[PDB]
Amino acid sequence: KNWSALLTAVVIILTIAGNILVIMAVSLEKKLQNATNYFLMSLAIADMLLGFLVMPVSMLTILYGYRWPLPSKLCAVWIYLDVLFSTAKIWHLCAISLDRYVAIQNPSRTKAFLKIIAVWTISVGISMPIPVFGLQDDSKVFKEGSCLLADDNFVLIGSFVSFFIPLTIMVITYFLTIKSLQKEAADLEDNWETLNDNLKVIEKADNAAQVKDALTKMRAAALDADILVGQIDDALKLANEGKVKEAQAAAEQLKTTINAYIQKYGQSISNEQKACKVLGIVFFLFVVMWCPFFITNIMAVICKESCNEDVIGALLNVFVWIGYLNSAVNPLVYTLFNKTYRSAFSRYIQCQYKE
Ligand SMILES: CC(C)CCC[C@@H](C)[C@H]1CC[C@H]2[C@@H]3CC=C4C[C@@H](O)CC[C@]4(C)[C@H]3CC[C@]12C
Numbered sequence: 456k457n458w459s460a461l462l463t464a465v466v467i468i469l470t471i472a473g474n475i476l477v478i479m480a481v482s483l484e485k486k487l488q489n490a491t492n493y494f495l496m497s498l499a500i501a502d503m504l505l506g507f508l509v510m511p512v513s514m515l516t517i518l519y520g521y522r523w524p525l526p527s528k529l530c531a532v533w534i535y536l537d538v539l540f541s542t543a544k545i546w547h548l549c550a551i552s553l554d555r556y557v558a559i560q561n562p563s564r565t566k567a568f569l570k571i572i573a574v575w576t577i578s579v580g581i582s583m584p585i586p587v588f589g590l591q592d593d594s595k596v597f598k599e600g601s602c603l604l605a606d607d608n609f610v611l612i613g614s615f616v617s618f619f620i621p622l623t624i625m626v627i628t629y630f631l632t633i634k635s636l637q638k639e640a641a642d643l644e645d646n647w648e649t650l651n652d653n654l655k656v657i658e659k660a661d662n663a664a665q666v667k668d669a670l671t672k673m674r675a676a677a678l679d680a681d682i683l684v685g686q687i688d689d690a691l692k693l694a695n696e697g698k699v700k701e702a703q704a705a706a707e708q709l710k711t712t713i714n715a716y717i718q719k720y721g722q723s724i725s726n727e728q729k730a731c732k733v734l735g736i737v738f739f740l741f742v743v744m745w746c747p748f749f750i751t752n753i754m755a756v757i758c759k760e761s762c763n764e765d766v767i768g769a770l771l772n773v774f775v776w777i778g779y780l781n782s783a784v785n786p787l788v789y790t791l792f793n794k795t796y797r798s799a800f801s802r803y804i805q806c807q808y809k810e
């Protein structure tokens with residue numbers, strides 16, 4: 456008689472339906488066809504595959520008191536799917552953080568589907584000791600007729616190698632991305648005063664000194680931020696001949712090109728900080744929900760002697776569902792914090808699929 460299967464059946468269908476909707480939204484709606492959204496589909500494939508393959512077998516074992524109810528050579532395989540799909544999500548979340556960072560030092564699907572194939576192959580490579588050695592020796596994958604990783608080298612080596620190369624690189628490249636977008640906003644409303652200051656200088660002017668210097672100083676300050684470089688140069692010639700009343704009126708026709716360009720760049724940055732913050736929640740929820748399973752699984756190995764493994768085991772059976780639930784919640788994040796995903800999901804529920 457088990458309570459727990461009534462709970463766990465919820466988490467599986469949330470996982471399956473939501474991650475299908477994310478897969479559906481990137482496949483269909485054109486305003487999601489960018490490289491960072493191509494990763495989020497691949498992530499959702501992993502979360503949906505976790506929900507189809509790994510999670511109902513976990514529920515099944517809950518209904519046999521953890522005494523493993525299937526063929527023995529499926530235990531080593533099930534473990535490989537359970538580790539792969541998670542190792543897939545951590546190298547996904549690392550890649551997005553890293554790819555958006557290299558995007559800031561810069562001015563395609565084949566961009567993305569090489570990088571996704573690069574990440575999946577580093578997951579398939581890293582998880583591959585499990586069935587190659589587990590299918591040889593049933594005592595890497597079974598303890599006491601319960602299917603679970605029973606090799607501590609695979610846990611210790613896998614956890615740090617598979618989760619601390621990527622987490623480190625993800626938490627550095629997330630932090631540096633925040634600092635790159637803070638310097639860009641700082642550097643742009645620096646150029647605001649420099650251009651704006653100099654406008655008030657050219658409108659006050661007496662002579663061709665105050666106009667030619669203050670368009671020289673406008674031009675280099677324009678060069679830090681395309682088309683307005685010519686429009687300063689189209690007005691830099693008027694002051695050089697001495698046409699001062701003409702260059703002053705040409706500059707209030709620069710004021711409109713300036714206000715138009717600054718706001719567009721400024722909207723783009725405020726977008727990309729809202730977008731950096733959405734991932735940061737996808738990133739934050741992943742660690743925090745796996746955090747109790749992770750720490751306890753490592754302490755299983757560290758205090759084999761000094762601790763009640765019945766209690767340690769009774770928590771791992773509980774803590775692994777906290778991290779399963781993480782599959783369910785990536786889609787909810789998008790629903791409340793993207794207009795684009797919410798509008799799309801709200802039309803797939805109305806069975807209406809034409810952009
Ligand atoms: C371990 C194996 C047997 C599990 C099964 C993996 C299956 C479900 C995976 C692997 C390859 C995946 C497909 C690869 C690429 C695409 C194209 C994309 O535009 C829509 C989804 C779609 C069609 C994927 C759907 C899910 C998929 C079919």
Ligand SMILES: CC(C)CCC[C@@H](C)[C@H]1CC[C@H]2[C@@H]3CC=C4C[C@@H](O)CC[C@]4(C)[C@H]3CC[C@]12C
Pocket residue numbers: 747750751754758761762763764766767770
């Ligand atoms: C009763 C006698 C034999 C002693 C048993 C001590 C056991 C039950 C103790 C010692 C080590 C402990 C674990 C150490 C680390 C963590 C991770 C953290 O998120 C809190 C829970 C958890 C998982 C603890 C639960 C209780 C624990 C398993």
Ligand SMILES: CN(C)C(=O)N[C@H]1CC[C@H](CCN2CCN(c3cccc(Cl)c3Cl)CC2)CC1
Pocket residue numbers: 533534537538541542545602603604618622741742745746748749771772775778
């Ligand atoms: C950022 N942080 C800290 C992390 O990502 N931590 C990680 C914690 C471990 C997660 C691995 C996923 N599997 C491992 C194997 N598990 C298992 C399988 C069969 C039987 C039994 Cl009993 C068990 Cl317990 C279930 C979960 C990935 C994330």
Ligand SMILES: [Mg+2]
Pocket residue numbers: 648649652
């Ligand atoms: Mg000033």
